[PDB]
Ligand binder design. Structure first.
Ligand SMILES: *[C@@H]1O[C@H](CO)[C@@H](O[C@@H]2O[C@H](CO)[C@@H](O[C@@H]3O[C@H](CO)[C@@H](O)[C@H](O)[C@@H]3O)[C@H](O)[C@H]2NC(C)=O)[C@H](O)[C@H]1NC(C)=O
Ligand SMILES: CC(=O)OCC[N+](C)(C)C
Ligand SMILES: CC(=O)OCC[N+](C)(C)C
Ligand SMILES: CC(=O)OCC[N+](C)(C)C
Ligand SMILES: [Ca+2]
Ligand SMILES: [Ca+2]
Ligand SMILES: [Ca+2]
Lengths: 217, 216, 214
């Protein structure tokens, strides 16, 4: 009953589910997990692990919360670090980042591979090559970095990157990207604490939509 | 049934951490797709009422409140038969969540909450106010049949549901009216909005409202 | 056996609109959107525009298999729409909203689309009623045209001029798969347009196309 069923969003597309939405796939350890499949963007078949859309969900959360995931299938959410690792351990998944502004401009960025280690390794980020994408690289800077929340500081910054830029991320010292920052709605005066992608709209603009998704590379 | 999930609390305990529509099995093993709020106040809440944008007409008749109405994609009332079925084993709390148009949030938690069957006209059986920023505006409605425009069971020589375009355990008539008209903030009209008297009062209609239960 | 249509589901006490799985006459599952509210309820919805978030200017293979998101806009796909209609008599119905929240509709006694061999050909009954007027009878007995597949009768490219897919003739009175232009637009007839409704220069806020047994 675990071997009958699907294991990625790509499988489901291959089996003729053409509509984006929440489907259940089976983890490599046979745990069933209800994921969001984007069956439309760039060929379709993407499993979506992060999604901001309207600012309705608090993303300024603690380690246990980022661990297990939070939010709503009906809106915004983080799939959870255990799940993101589970999905990306064994094998090779490409990463697509899709973004939108409040002026309705669509941007993206695409990476060759994407993997996060387990909690023992603080969900460490293993990033392949920037392939292309009109949003430009603002993730490579964050390669080989542990992931930090406000209540657990694993960055290379003598202070707390998560309290400062008000998010949660593979911070370094601190970031060129902050997709789990505060939903600030466009141009903001405050520094780099919005849904920010430095090479995109920069440190003072917070996107309307953001999605981070994976697909078997 | 029986092994599977009985409540939204079960589903959380079993590792569904994301809010959303899941199917649970009632005290009678009838399968029921409900909305689980896996986030608020510990999570594990089954949500039976939701206003969010004003897209759904709530000024409806008895048969409609009976069976429920609305959309999983937005606003809805789970239906009185279902709400009764859900709280029959009268040991589950009520939380009322409310958001204004400046994103200021408020709430009100009650220690038990139960509605009788249609025979007893979905009478409201409410426990104690425990805590909450909304102030308490539900108690006043304890031990009262539920009325809709076409089924007048209030203590008011007229038709309360008509006079406040809603449906409720109306007395004479109300201090709370969460099924009233989606009036969008301050309104001139009297007490016919999504109103909670002790909250923002008789002339302010909230942006969001949710009524949810969980086993104590 | 189980759920053949959204009407079945309503008859079984699913009163809330939303995505349910039903069983096509071949017995293939399909998760469809049920509108359990409008005009008695029990409608299976095969098209929906709501906010302009999804690109509808797509190619034949894409309209074939469907595209979009259960969370928003989408086209159920022509194979599914054919599967969905052909076997029985389903009764089309269109719901249009303009930006001043004015509501209009049209209803048709029957609605069917042929298979891909016949170019998903539109086979349409008579106008029952509709305050939107009738901007679709005009399109009866016409193959589907995508920007990349031209089967229209303007030897120019209808789909390209107006950017959308439809059973185009020479060219259109309705264009519900056109560009989400947000109300009044200067460009000609390339929005979400229904000619007898708010005409060739207004693009609705919402549009839905849904079917139900007669
Ligand atoms: C991820 O970051 C870690 C730090 O947490 C990086 O580890 C460091 O890697 C350098 C070389 O890249 C190591 O230097 C080597 O070791 C000896 C010193 O004992 C030196 O003499 C050798 O010549 C060699 O340079 C360094 O020791 C090491 N630091 C730590 C803290 O272990 C690691 O390289 C990063 N991983 C990737 C794939 O980038
Ligand atoms: C930080 C965060 O995730 O919010 C919850 C705080 N808690 C669990 C201590 C009440
Ligand atoms: C008021 C309301 O809930 O609508 C139902 C009335 N009827 C009979 C037209 C369906
Ligand atoms: C709109 C709705 O579902 O209730 C009225 C019933 N109708 C329209 C079939 C008479
Ligand atoms: Ca530090
Ligand atoms: Ca009375
Ligand atoms: Ca031509």
């Amino acid at each position: 009953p675990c071997l009958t069923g699907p294991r990625t969003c790509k499988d489901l597309l291959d089996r003729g589910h053409f509509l984006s939405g929440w489907h259940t796939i089976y983890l490599p350890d046979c745990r069933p997990l209800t994921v969001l499949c984007d069956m439309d963007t760039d060929g379709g078949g993407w499993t979506v692990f992060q999604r901001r859309v309207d600012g309705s969900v608090d993303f300024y959360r603690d380690w246990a919360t980022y661990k297990q995931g939070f939010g709503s299938r009906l809106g915004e959410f983080w799939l959870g670090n255990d799940n993101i690792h589970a999905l990306t351990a064994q094998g090779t998944s490409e990463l697509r980042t899709d973004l939108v502004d409040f002026e309705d401009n669509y941007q993206f960025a695409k990476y060759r591979s994407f993997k996060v280690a387990d909690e023992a390794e603080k969900y460490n980020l293993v990033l392949g090559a920037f392939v292309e994408g009109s949003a430009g690289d603002s993730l490579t800077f964050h390669n080989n970095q542990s992931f930090s929340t406000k209540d657990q500081d694993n960055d290379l910054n003598t202070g707390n990157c998560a309290v400062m830029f008000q998010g949660a991320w593979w911070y370094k010292n601190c970031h060129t990207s902050n997709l789990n920052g505060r939903y600030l709605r466009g141009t903001h005066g405050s520094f780099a604490n919005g849904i920010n992608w430095k090479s995109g709209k920069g440190y003072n603009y917070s996107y309307k939509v953001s999605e981070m998704k994976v697909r078997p590379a």
